[PDB]
Design a binder for this molecule. Structure first.
Ligand SMILES: *C/C=C(C)/C=C/C=C(C)/C=C/C1=C(C)CCCC1(C)C
Ligand SMILES: CCCCCCCCCCCCCCCCCCCC
Ligand SMILES: CCCCCCCCCCCCCCCCCCCC
Ligand SMILES: CCCCCCCCCCCCCCCCCCCC
Ligand SMILES: CCCCCCCCCCCCCCCCCCCC
Ligand SMILES: CCCCCCCCCCCCCCCCCCCC
Ligand SMILES: CCCCCCCCCCCCCCCCCCCC
Ligand SMILES: CCCCCCCCCCCCCCCCCCCC
Ligand SMILES: CCCCCCCCCCCCCCCCCCCC
Ligand SMILES: CCCCCCCCCCCCCCCCCCCC
Ligand SMILES: CCCCCCCCCCCCCCCCCCCC
Length: 265
């Protein structure tokens, strides 16, 4: 199956790699619940014309909280401690670790995170329906092809990389459309709004790039380097969680600050 189950079935997990990963995943869904409350409570602070962005942030928070909670429980209950060896190992009587929860979260959140900026900025020469359709098509294809490659993570590293490269083609199309959206959205808004939009672009670029980084993380030190271990598992889940908080919660806070800035007129 996946690299997490491979490690848990051969070398097992140290108590520190197991507990750290449980804690980081728990932090992940706890932040989404706090974000859910934040976006509900602050919807009164933006003009009606921008509130669809707060609404979409709140729906993403629900998606992420429920599915990261499921992923968290799946991590903790998939490995049991062997007192003889002193490590956690894959439990044959459990469900085994499954990354489907996170991939389903991506299929849901990606179309909504890309959609919601179109309710705060105005396009100029681009058409709303054209940008929306390009975001939704390439976002869904990016996740589908990525999910396929994920099946070959352990069994066929070459198919793993080929599918992930196909997925990356769709990712670069998204980055290209988003850059055009940001550029058109900067036209004829205030300098303070243009500065926030520049920050949104940098946040978007870095936080979304973290996801392919975490996808590749165990092979980034080679076919048997330092990361091809429980340390690549800790690092992959830490980088996912950082990307999750950044791409969903911080991105949404910044769009709300932009909406407030744009009401000053
Ligand atoms: C909150 C969830 C978000 C923002 C998910 C974003 C996911 C991606 C940008 C995934 C990208 C991938 C690649 C570009 C190549 C390798 C496979 C993926 C699916 C991890
Ligand atoms: C707008 C007001 C911002 C305050 C939000 C503080 C969040 C605290 C997180 C949990 C501590
Ligand atoms: C610009 C207004 C100030 C931003 C406040 C952001 C608050 C986001 C709430 C989610 C963060 C919760 C962190 C602690 C959870 C554990
Ligand atoms: C309007 C007050 C801001 C609410 C912050 C969101 C609650 C965070 C809970 C942790
Ligand atoms: C539309 C936002 C709600 C999406 C929820 C997705 C289903 C959650 C499933 C959790 C357990 C599997
Ligand atoms: C088209 C595929 C997009 C992601 C689907 C992943 C569904 C996995 C659901 C979790 C399974 C729990 C067992
Ligand atoms: C406006 C949001 C439209 C997309 C939400 C659901 C994403 C795909 C679910 C399958
Ligand atoms: C300049 C306003 C702050 C933009 C970045 C804020 C997020 C940094 C990580 C927390
Ligand atoms: C588009 C894919 C980005 C992957 C970033 C990983 C960088 C690895 C550096 C070693
Ligand atoms: C805006 C978020 C910035 C995150 C920078 C990347 C974090 C590096 C963690 C690497 C751990 C190995
Ligand atoms: C004007 C721009 C101000 C943007 C503020 C961004 C900071 C948001 C803080 C939320 C971070 C929550 C993460 C807590 C995890 C521990």
């Amino acid at each position: 199956a996946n690299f997490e189950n491979f490690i848990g079935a051969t070398e097992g997990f140290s108590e520190i790699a197991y507990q750290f990963t449980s804690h980081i995943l728990t932090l992940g869904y706890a932040v989404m619940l706090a974000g859910l409350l934040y976006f509900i409570l602050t919807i009164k602070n933006v003009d009606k014309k921008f509130q669809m962005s707060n609404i979409l942030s709140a729906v993403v928070m629900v998606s992420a909280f429920l599915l990261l909670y499921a992923q968290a429980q799946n991590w903790t209950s998939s490995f049991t401690f062997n007192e003889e060896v002193g490590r956690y190992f894959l439990d044959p009587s459990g469900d085994l670790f499954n990354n489907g929860y996170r991939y389903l979260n991506w299929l849901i959140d990606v179309p909504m995170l890309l959609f919601q900026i179109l309710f705060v900025v105005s396009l100029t020469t681009s058409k709303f329906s054209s940008v929306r359709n390009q975001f939704w098509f390439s976002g869904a294809m990016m996740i589908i092809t990525g999910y396929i490659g994920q099946f070959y993570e352990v069994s066929n590293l070459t198919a793993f990389l080929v599918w992930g490269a196909i997925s990356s083609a769709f990712f670069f199309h998204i980055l290209w459309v988003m850059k055009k959206v940001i550029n058109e959205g900067k036209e004829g808004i205030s300098p303070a709004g243009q500065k926030i939009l520049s920050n949104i672009w940098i946040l978007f670029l870095i936080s979304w790039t973290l996801y392919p980084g975490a996808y590749l993380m165990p092979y980034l030190t080679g076919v048997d380097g330092f990361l091809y271990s429980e340390d690549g598992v800790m690092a992959r889940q830490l980088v996912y969680t950082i990307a999750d908080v950044s791409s969903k919660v911080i991105y949404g806070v910044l769009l709300g600050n932009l909406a407030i800035t744009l009401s000053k007129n």
